[PDB]
């Protein structure tokens, strides 16, 4: 550029937080018209451009980077660098491919070629939601918003993370191998099952902070809350504050590996309807009318 | 093979910095596009 020492004027009123009082003493200096023609010449020099506001004029925004150049990254055309600062200023998550062609109404190859050219020197280093409805993506740096510790979380460490949960909560309000036999099953409950009684109250946070893998593990009370909902709405009652009672359904197919063997002690009444075992129909046997009768394809 | 073929395959390493000279003169920026190109790679290959 080089016109005149106001380029480092403008660093020096860009170096720290500013706002309209900057140029308020930008314009206070010297004589008016002369610093309203030069600074709409440095404008005019690849600087920040104003903002339209209830107030009279802002800065855009903070910083001195000043990196467009506006001829040489492998070729020269006066669309790439503006594409650039079009993407500069996306926002939190970023910018659509839908977006950018529905301002400047231009073509959609030029925007391929625009992808290509500035991937050839990375500035087009995309951050990926979880869903993809119209490609929410190329934004500027380092990946940040991510909308992800538990929606990102698919799927097996968050199945052994429910796994342990579950072990830990019944082996916290509920004692650990009195669910195996009926011989005397937790010895009249909890001693008398009165005020004992207790739960976890941020413990199984505690038990998550026992041990991690350190990756997404660092939860600060919300993913656990997510995983509560996720559990109190299958095998979990809970009653109101953190009492989770994780019985009904956690003895039966909990001690049927090792625990339920063969030879027991009495025959089961028919249709038990909290059951799921043992129900096997054929061979090949399918002949009359055994259990081939639910919903039939009406 | 020896039929004066075998013996006048390689010269001494007198005048072959030389010829290294030479070539890192003239094909230098192939040799500076391909290891740039390789530190493009190890740069962008990081993130996912």
Redesign the interface.
Known sequence: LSDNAKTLHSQMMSKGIGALFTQQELQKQMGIGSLTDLMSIVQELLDKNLIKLVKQNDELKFQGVLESEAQKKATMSAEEALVYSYIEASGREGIWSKTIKARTNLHQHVVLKCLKSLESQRYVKSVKSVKFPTRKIYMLYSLQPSVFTDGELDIEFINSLLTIVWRFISENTFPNGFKNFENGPKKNVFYAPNVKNYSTTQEILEFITAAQVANVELTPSNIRSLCEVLVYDDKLEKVTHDCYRVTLESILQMNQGEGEPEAGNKALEDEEEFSIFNYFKMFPASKHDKEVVYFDEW | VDDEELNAHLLNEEASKLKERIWIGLNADFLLEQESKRL?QE??IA??
């Open positions: 493009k740069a962008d993130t996912g």
